Amino acid sequence: PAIVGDEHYRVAQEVIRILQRYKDLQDIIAILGIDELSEEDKQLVNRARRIERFLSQNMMAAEQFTGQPGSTVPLKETIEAFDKLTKGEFDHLPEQAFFLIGGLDDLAKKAESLGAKL
Amino acid sequence: DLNVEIVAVERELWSGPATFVFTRTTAGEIGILPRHIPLVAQLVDDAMVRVEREGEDDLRIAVDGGFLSVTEETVRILVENAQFESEIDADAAKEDAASDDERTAAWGRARLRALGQI
């Protein structure tokens, strides 16, 4: 918190906590399925899948491999977007909408292309 | 005296001694006294039961799917559903009364009669 500030540190720690819990629950989901998780754990699993997809990004150097031009996200936008994600504000969007995009504008455009409204 | 047993399908609701059991069967209003003859009757759709007990306030019960069985040793009212006067809420009963659905209208009218508004 001293260097990056309280907001950045808190958002990063929340993201790490959610991803750690999802990693813990992956085996249970694989064997018994998601339907046997508590409602809060189902919510966390959905949030974690969206977060892990959103951590991916189309890179400038990756175009040669995908044909998609790269993107850059400012730090403030990243912190705000992951704060929103950790609160479940994008839980209604499909997880595929979060895959290989930039900021929240890219998320909205891709969600619209996939039939959902951000 | 006569023992009254208000029994629902899922559970036995009420059981105890009484002094006068008023209800409204299909034929008409009937009042059971301690040594009434054996009888089997069908309570009306919006029926209501009034139990006058010894040294206690009367008990008003809204009854749905009612049936009455007097055996000269205990009065047994078998109900698909029932609601005591205290538990009944006025506003919901008013809302569900005068509804096109016959079943809900009958239930609402029974609740109104049990409350006292008729």
């Binding site: 085996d27 249970i28 694989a30 046997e36 | 399908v9 036995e12 009757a41 069908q42 078998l78």
Partner: protein, 249 residues
């Protein structure tokens, strides 16, 4: 990297063990609850049985719900299964019993018209491509009397609509009904023993005995009999649902 994957598998197995043990204890508690609900439901069943028996004793036993159709060709069958699937052989045993009932009915020159309670049976019959007229789901774990009332209403309505049917024609009703109503569910005989059984809800063959102040019925014994028989069918369906829930737990 064999050791690393082995350690990962050990962690996964430990987590699965913890979850399964917790689910087992929760299932023990739920068995207690289901047995309590069955006990709570017992007295109303007893009283309604006695009342219906008296009404039959003081009335003509010629209700259309008590007479076997002529050259019957259809039979309604309600298969009661679970919604959640972590029961071991519950659904498999129930569906095996249902298939045996179908074989018996087909050997008896009938056609099964299928109704389903629960999702596992829905999936089974969807795979088999057997048609399901209606399905009720989402209450197998803890069924209420309203669900049983709805199921019994639908089944009895189909049975009555089957009275006027002639051959494959629906008759004056316009609805092609059935000539029988069977229930295939699991009995909770004891904590150790659960048995899937097929039971004919309708038509109800009359059981007679010699003997045991006559009752004074109003308005008429026949009217009360007609208004009570569907109630008895609903009560039996509710008892079957409660026993199925206990057996599933």
């Amino acid at each position: 990297a064999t050791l690393r994957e082995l350690r990962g598998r050990i962690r996964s197995a430990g987590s699965i063990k913890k979850i399964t043990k917790a689910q087992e204890l929760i299932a023990t508690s739920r068995i207690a609850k289901a047995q309590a609900r069955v006990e709570a439901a017992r007295p109303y069943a007893a009283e309604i049985t006695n009342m219906l028996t008296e009404l039959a004793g003081a009335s003509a036993l010629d209700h259309p719900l008590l007479v076997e159709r002529k050259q019957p060709k259809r039979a309604g069958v309600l298969v009661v299964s679970s919604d959640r699937g972590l029961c071991g052989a519950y659904n498999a045993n129930v569906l095996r019993r249902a298939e045996e009932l179908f074989s018996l009915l087909r050997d008896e020159g009938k056609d099964p018209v299928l109704y389903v309670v629960g999702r596992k049976a829905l999936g089974y019959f969807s795979f088999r491509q057997r048609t399901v007229v209606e399905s009720w789901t989402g209450f197998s774990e803890r069924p209420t009397y309203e669900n049983a009332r709805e199921i019994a209403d639908t089944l009895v309505n189909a049975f009555m609509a089957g009275a006027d049917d002639e051959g494959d024609d629906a008759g004056a009703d316009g609805i092609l009904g059935v000539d029988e109503l069977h229930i295939v569910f699991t009995e909770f005989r004891s904590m150790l023993s659960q048995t899937a059984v097929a039971r004919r809800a309708a038509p109800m063959e009359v059981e007679y005995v010699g003997e045991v102040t006559l009752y004074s019925f109003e308005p008429d014994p026949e009217t009360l009999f007609d208004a009570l028989l569907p109630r008895y069918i609903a009560t039996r369906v509710y008892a079957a649902l409660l026993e199925a829930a206990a057996s599933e737990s």
